[PDB]
Design an enzyme around this catalytic site. Structure first.
Site, PDB file in Angstrom:
ATOM      1  CB  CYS A   7      -0.933  -0.002   1.213  1.00 55.53           C
ATOM      2  SG  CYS A   7      -1.838   1.542   1.479  1.00 55.53           S
ATOM      3  CB  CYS A  20      -0.699   2.145   4.202  1.00 55.69           C
ATOM      4  SG  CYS A  20      -2.236   1.545   3.472  1.00 55.69           S
TER       5      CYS A  20
END
Ligand SMILES: Nc1ncnc2c1ncn2[C@@H]1O[C@H](COP(=O)(O)OP(=O)(O)OP(O)(O)=S)[C@@H](O)[C@H]1O
Ligand SMILES: [Mg+2]
Lengths: 698, 106
Positions: free
Chosen positions: B32, B35
């Site tokens: 990700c 993130c």
């Protein structure tokens, strides 16, 4: 079968859009850099140390942008390409994924499954170790955009591929990933979200060596391939057009179908559309039925309208086709049946485009009317549709279909539309207009080509450029350069054809075959380019053509040899229009000059001007040169500068010049190294000949 | 500072030991992007006011059971738990809004 080699460009310039036309001339030549590459360097470092992130594969229809990536994947599978940077490679097709609307990361990993299915966790924990292959992002009507970004969805969660591939390319899921994007047309900014930096690879076709191996590696018996190659080489235009793998494959299939039962090989086809019609005629052996093919063309057009190639069985019934029609079409080979539940599709997208081109002409009897096909000059639909309306194009359809059809007026009415839509002249437009091989057509649609120069990359592109530029009126000067030695003016009659790609001995072999039926483009320039003996032989064959009208020709700095000079002199005998010949900065000998001197002294070969600057001639050949001056009635200007001609040569030339029959007016001879009395003799000779002028550097 | 959760037992131990301090659980993955660009910001905020807020890092790949228990699919996701009870949760790497949520819930 085996992957024939393809040329690939590595232009270090983003081909996103050029809204501001071309502007300055050096900018346009600067943009087309070239920089050919091998297969094992596509994802290499490049110019700087920043490796590319997304690689884009452009090219024409059927150019080979759907097999190169498959070959890369197969080679990695057997371990011969990129075995240390990509841990795994994933093979996807946008056309295949367009059918389904529920897909996720886990689902696509499972569908790919090149090896035993590996856990997703370790796949997603190695970002800079994966490769993604697509087979054309323009085939479906996708958008490829991520929804509001700022978040990534978990795997195995349903999501349309339109937003999933967009998120993958948007540095959201697996950010540092290498993408092998293949496209047919440029301007992918709308389709690719924030593309920015990207490696723009331009896929070419089959060169001489690649064509050699492909034609050799197509049949089983050697003699069949030998005769096939001999006939293809005989038809020069087919050699020019066989760069595209589609054209070569179609020609080989036609040859095999001819040779199947009992036939002699005969190919008068000189364009892609005529070859396609000839193939269709071979497939349509007898079969007087015609409405069935029209219905097939109609269904192909309907499918290509709504971005469809895989025709559902129910779509066949609404278009009139039945079981027997489908059975016959499979028997001949236009349609193919896959190990898939009931469905039907063509064997290639190009044939679908070809059949979508015939339905329009069968139902009709400007760019807005091309909405269904789209891509003005950027779609082979337009190419086939235009080429089908030519005199040669409207010659084979009249045998398949018993309808007489329009006689040239269906193309005459297309003339104003194209003429209004061809103000920004381009290369793809040149292919589209060349597809219509008509004198009547290519005289008002192209008599506006007031360009300044452009890039020539391929053999078919060179043939198309020569054919189209010939069929105009403004151009007088045609020049070819190697590009690095770019030295040209800005005359309105100047067209600059530059190449930054090294070529085999076919660039001039196909150009010299186009100077047939030459128009007012009489002056020809090719100085700087390095030729060979066979190229000079082809040029003298061109000069030998009775209908060739070359008036002034220059061959400066081509690295010519003495042997080819005899061929040039022999070619000059069957010519009465050439008046100026330039051989400056050329490597000749005394015997080479003797061959020219033999032809010049003849009463024919009215060469008014001849230049022999820096030819390395010595005093040995001045006897022959003096004989030329004393015998030829047509030489008006002769240049002999930058030659170590010494005193004996100057005296011999003075003996020839003193003859009253000499027609020379201005001569160029070096006098710095001559003796004291030599300038006195030259001054007296000029005094007794007021029409004689001798010039030098300055 | 951020504390990495290895299993459910560790998660419940940290929630029990947090006491009255507000607890934030973040769902992040190595692949990700948002993130791992919002992680440093959350770490800086936790360092700034560690006397009242504690941040817990849990990996979705290594703690699939935790993700199934909390019923979250999209990342990044921040979950706020007070007195071992969830009070608020959201998804997205919006730094300003997560700052505001921490400020209101502290
Ligand atoms: N290296 C190659 N060697 C041999 N045949 C080739 C090679 N590359 C392409 N072909 C032939 O080209 C055809 C397939 O070309 P494709 O690459 O699929 O065309 P294309 O790029 O999909 O064009 P489209 O459909 O308009 S996007 C087949 O007939 C292949 O045999
Ligand atoms: Mg393709």
């Amino acid at each position: 079968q085996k992957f024939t080699q393809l040329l690939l460009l590595q232009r270090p310039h983003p081909r996103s859009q050029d809204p501001l036309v071309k502007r300055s001339w050096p900018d346009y030549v600067e943009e087309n850099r070239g920089h050919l590459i091998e297969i094992r360097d596509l994802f290499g470092p490049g110019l700087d140390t920043q490796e590319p992130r997304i690689v884009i594969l452009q090219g024409a229809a059927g150019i080979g942008k759907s097999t190169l990536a498959r070959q890369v994947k197969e080679a990695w599978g057997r371990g011969q390409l990129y075995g240390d940077r990509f841990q795994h490679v994933f093979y996807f097709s946008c056309r295949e994924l367009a059918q389904s609307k529920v897909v996720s990361l886990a689902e696509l990993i499972g569908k790919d499954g090149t090896a035993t299915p590996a856990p997703i966790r370790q796949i997603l924990s190695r970002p800079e170790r994966l490769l993604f292959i697509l087979d054309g992002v323009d085939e479906p009507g996708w958008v490829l955009q991520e929804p509001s970004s700022e978040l990534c969805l978990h795997w195995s969660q349903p999501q349309p591929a339109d937003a999933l591939l967009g998120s993958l390319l948007g540095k959201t899921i697996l950010p540092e990933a290498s993408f092998l994007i293949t496209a047919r047309t440029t301007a992918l900014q709308n389709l690719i979200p924030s593309l920015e930096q990207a490696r723009w690879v331009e896929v070419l076709g089959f060169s001489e060596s690649s064509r050699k191996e492909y034609f050799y590696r197509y049949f089983t018996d050697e003699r069949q391939a030998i005769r096939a190659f001999r006939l293809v080489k005989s038809n020069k235009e087919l050699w020019a057009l066989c760069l595209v793998p589609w054209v070569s494959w179609l020609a080989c299939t036609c040859l095999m179908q001819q040779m199947k039962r009992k036939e002699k090989l005969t190919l008068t086809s000189k364009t892609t559309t005529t070859l396609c019609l000839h193939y269709l005629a071979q497939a349509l052996q007898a079969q007087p039925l015609g409405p069935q093919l029209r219905d097939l063309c109609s269904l192909a057009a309907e499918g290509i309208w709504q971005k469809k190639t895989l025709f559902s069985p129910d779509d066949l019934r609404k278009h009139g086709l039945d079981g027997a029609i489908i059975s016959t079409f499979l028997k001949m080979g236009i349609l193919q049946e896959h190990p898939i539940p009931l469905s039907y599709s063509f064997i290639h997208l190009c044939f679908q485009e070809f059949f979508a081109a015939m339905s329009y002409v069968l139902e009709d009897e400007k760019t807005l009317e091309a909405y269904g096909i789209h891509g003005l000059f950027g779609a082979s639909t337009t190419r086939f549709l235009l080429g089908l309306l030519s005199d040669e194009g409207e010659r084979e359809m009249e045998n398949i279909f018993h309808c007489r059809l329009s006689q040239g007026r269906n193309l005459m009415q297309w003339v104003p539309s194209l003429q209004l839509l061809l103000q920004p002249h381009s290369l793809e437009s040149l292919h589209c207009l060349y597809e219509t091989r008509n004198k009547t057509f290519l005289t008002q649609v192209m008599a506006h080509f007031e360009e300044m120069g452009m890039c020539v990359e391929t053999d078919m592109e060179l043939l198309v450029c020569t054919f189209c530029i010939k069929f105009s009126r403004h151009v007088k000067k045609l020049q070819l350069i190697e590009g690095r030695q770019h030295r040209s003016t800005w005359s309105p009659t100047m067209v600059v054809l530059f190449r930054w790609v090294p070529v085999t001995d076919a660039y001039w072999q196909i150009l010299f075959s186009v100077l047939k039926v030459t128009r007012n483009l009489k002056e020809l320039d090719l100085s700087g380019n390095s030729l060979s003996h066979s190229a000079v032989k082809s040029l003298c064959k061109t000069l030998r053509r009775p209908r060739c009208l070359l008036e002034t020709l220059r061959l400066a700095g081509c690295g010519l040899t003495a042997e080819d000079c005899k061929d040039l002199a022999f070619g000059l005998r069957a010519n009465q229009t050439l008046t100026e010949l330039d051989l400056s900065f050329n490597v000749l000998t005394d015997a080479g000059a003797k061959h020219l001197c033999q032809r010049l002294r003849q009463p024919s070969c009215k060469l008014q001007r001849l230049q022999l600057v820096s030819c390395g001639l010595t005093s040995d050949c001045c006897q022959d040169l003096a004989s030329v001056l004393s015998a030829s009635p047509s030489l008006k200007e002769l240049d002999l500068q930058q030659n170590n001609l010494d005193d004996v040569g100057v005296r011999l030339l003075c003996e020839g010049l003193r003859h009253p029959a000499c027609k020379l007016i201005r001569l160029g001879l070096d006098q710095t190294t001559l003796s004291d009395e030599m300038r006195q003799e030259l001054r007296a000779l000029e005094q007794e000949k007021p029409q004689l002028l001798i010039f030098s550097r300055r | 500072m951020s504390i990495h959760i290895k299993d459910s037992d560790d998660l419940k131990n940290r929630l029990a030991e947090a006491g009255d301090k507000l607890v934030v659980i973040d769902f992040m993955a190595t692949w990700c992007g948002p993130c791992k660009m919002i992680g440093p910001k959350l770490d800086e905020m936790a360092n700034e006011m560690s006397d009242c807020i504690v941040v817990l890092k849990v990996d979705v790949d290594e703690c699939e059971d935790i993700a199934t228990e909390y019923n979250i699919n999209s990342m990044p996701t921040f979950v706020f738990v007070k007195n071992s009870k969830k009070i608020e949760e959201f998804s997205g790497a919006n730094v300003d809004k997560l700052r505001n949520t921490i400020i209101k819930l502290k």
